[PDB]
Design an enzyme around this catalytic site. Structure first.
Site, mmCIF file in Angstrom:
data_model
loop_
_atom_site.group_PDB
_atom_site.id
_atom_site.type_symbol
_atom_site.label_atom_id
_atom_site.label_comp_id
_atom_site.label_asym_id
_atom_site.label_seq_id
_atom_site.Cartn_x
_atom_site.Cartn_y
_atom_site.Cartn_z
ATOM 1 N N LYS B 46 0.797 -1.209 0.000
ATOM 2 C CA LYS B 46 0.000 0.000 0.000
ATOM 3 C C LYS B 46 0.844 1.280 0.000
ATOM 4 O O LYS B 46 0.338 2.325 -0.420
ATOM 5 C CB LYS B 46 -0.988 0.048 1.143
ATOM 6 N N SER B 268 -2.717 -12.497 4.625
ATOM 7 C CA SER B 268 -3.072 -12.549 3.208
ATOM 8 C C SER B 268 -2.000 -13.227 2.386
ATOM 9 O O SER B 268 -2.304 -13.771 1.328
ATOM 10 C CB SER B 268 -3.429 -11.145 2.624
HETATM 11 C C1 PLP Z 1 -4.870 -4.146 0.889
HETATM 12 C C2 PLP Z 1 -4.279 -5.495 1.278
HETATM 13 C C3 PLP Z 1 -4.543 -6.601 0.451
HETATM 14 C C4 PLP Z 1 -5.351 -6.463 -0.815
HETATM 15 O O1 PLP Z 1 -4.716 -5.692 -1.870
HETATM 16 P P1 PLP Z 1 -5.559 -4.789 -2.884
HETATM 17 O O2 PLP Z 1 -4.502 -4.333 -3.802
HETATM 18 O O3 PLP Z 1 -6.337 -3.840 -2.052
HETATM 19 O O4 PLP Z 1 -6.513 -5.740 -3.609
HETATM 20 C C5 PLP Z 1 -4.037 -7.858 0.809
HETATM 21 N N1 PLP Z 1 -3.290 -8.027 1.958
HETATM 22 C C6 PLP Z 1 -3.061 -6.967 2.805
HETATM 23 C C7 PLP Z 1 -2.237 -7.177 4.056
HETATM 24 C C8 PLP Z 1 -3.514 -5.687 2.434
HETATM 25 O O5 PLP Z 1 -3.258 -4.635 3.230
#
Ligand code: PLP
Ligand code: PLP
Ligand code: CA
Ligand code: CA
Ligand code: CA
Ligand code: CA
Ligand code: CA
Ligand code: CA
Ligand code: CA
Lengths: 299, 302
Positions: B46, B268
């Protein structure tokens, strides 16, 4: 590419300070928090292990055992994960709980000692654990020459290359004394006029006043029962100090003003460096501060 | 020197993240490379979108020195914005519920963010967001869900790094979704340069919006969408299939990555990597070069 996270150790960034007034000198912070294990100790974990391997001291079922304040345990945990070695750490219960959680995330087994007795009590307990282990290797960071040697070979060379040999001052926190001593040793071999200063906690001023005490600057301070062998005091142009609260406050100044999230020792080392800069104002000095770890584990 | 790492600010550390090969976990005769976005100075991908959204807005004249940046978010985007705004000296307000972790609240506050807390749903955050707008003379709302500079940042940087690091030898790209920007931006670019590449988004198995048309509770922090609906920046026409991961498997794989590879990724990353392993197993011994995006580092979830 990297073949493993081991290939990401070192080659850390050196970042210029832009918003904090540095008094007509340039201050650069070497971010050892960018190492995969989030501290400079990845470097010494890697070298102590790799040299032991080369010397035939580590088989695949050798149990690595070490007393640590935390970051050496984390660096070792991470390297042992990659290499599939078993690591046991002895550590004080007084350190940031995030240290324990990080080591355990890598599969490390932790044995806890009374933090009020310092790193001496960890080293003691490690003797007891040795008796239950059939085959072990103790890196022994407070005496292992591969601690300062790692910094002499990599950390210092990175500083010289990134600044194209223009470095006037190097300032570095101390615990083992390895990162200060190894880096300063190489820097002084290449730059005879460089000034190199260690920092210690004002509340545990072993080098500057001759006694220790409780402090909150995690990773710094000498509590093994003397000055570590890996600390080379001849390299110190003077001993700098920082109080606990000033270290915490400077840690926050760095994050607010520079977006640099360093540990408590980073706050301490940087405060000492900024004070030094103020005392030597308007000389156009290039001053390098080693940020030993990232700040996420202290929030 | 030319291959040195001198930086003017932490902004110069954003991007150029490493690809690491998986060696200890069985990947079934295909090569899996994890792109470690946890290497970014704000510890997630991000940072890339925070940087592009702010810099494009500066360039548009939407951000003056006294413009307040305001975003309703509880995640990595807030951290990324906080770090960027620290460097650039912009005032940042982040709106999120009562009920979020002190972990992320404190990280954002460490960079100087004003975190404003509401009652925990998202509806109550939006009314606070409207209230703050009304109170400010000057503001900019990045809006990661609608701002095309979210996917464009990944199209321009993330995808180009993947192509460069593997000398254009990429067969499969797999990426977790929340906004859908990292998936959609990166897959767009990769497909333009490599027409045979397969690109797959991952969603939480217990919030299978894209695959089954409904929302549910999950624990894969940063992933999942709301209803709400599918974000504007998600481009489903790029998805060769939708992959999923259960909560339990995401945590297990997170643990496996740190134990066996020394890779400490977030939840994630565990989810996305588990999906890629399940994919690699259905395609065993093809010598496929599979790239998984590890969106953040794991420290904050311990
Ligand atoms: C935002 C985020 C995602 C998803 O990514 P996008 O580009 O918003 O689809 C996955 N894992 C984490 C830890 C995130 O902060
Ligand atoms: C180990 C450590 C130090 C001191 O470094 P040495 O090379 O041992 O002197 C400073 N800060 C932190 C956070 C540390 O872990
Ligand atoms: Ca010489
Ligand atoms: Ca001298
Ligand atoms: Ca004080
Ligand atoms: Ca096989
Ligand atoms: Ca324009
Ligand atoms: Ca600010
Ligand atoms: Ca602020």
């Amino acid at each position: 590419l990297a073949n493993s996270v081991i290939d990401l150790i070192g080659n850390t960034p050196l970042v210029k300070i832009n918003n904090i007034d540095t008094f007509g000198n340039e201050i650069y912070v070497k971010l050892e928090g960018s190492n995969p294990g989030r501290s400079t100790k990845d470097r010494i974990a890697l070298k102590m292990i790799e040299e032991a391997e080369k010397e035939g001291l580590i088989d695949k079922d050798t149990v690595i055992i070490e007393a640590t304040s935390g970051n050496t345990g984390i660096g070792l945990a991470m390297i042992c994960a990659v290499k599939n070695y078993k690591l046991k750490i002895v550590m004080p219960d007084t350190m940031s709980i995030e240290r324990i959680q990080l080591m355990r995330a890598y599969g490390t087994e932790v044995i806890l000692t009374d933090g009020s007795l310092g790193m001496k009590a960890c080293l003691e307990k490690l003797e007891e654990l040795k008796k239950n282990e059939k085959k072990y290797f103790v890196p022994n960071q407070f005496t292992n020459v591969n601690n300062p040697k790692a910094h002499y070979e990599t950390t210092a060379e990175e500083i010289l290359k990134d600044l194209n040999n223009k470095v006037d001052v190097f300032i570095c926190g101390t615990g083992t004394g390895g990162s200060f001593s190894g880096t300063a040793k190489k820097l002084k071999e290449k730059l005879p006029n460089i000034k190199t200063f260690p920092v210690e906690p004002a509340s545990s001023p072993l080098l500057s006043k001759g006694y220790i005490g409780p402090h909150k600057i995690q990773g710094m301070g000498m509590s093994i029962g003397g000055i570590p062998a890996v600390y080379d005091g001849s390299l110190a142009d003077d001993i700098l100090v920082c109080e606990d609260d000033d270290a915490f406050e400077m840690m926050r100044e760095l994050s607010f003003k520079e977006g640099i999230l360093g540990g408590i020792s980073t706050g301490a080392t940087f405060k000492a460096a900024l004070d030094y800069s103020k005392e030597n104002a308007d000389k156009g000095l290039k001053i390098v501060v080693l940020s030993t770890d990232s700040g996420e584990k202290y929030l």
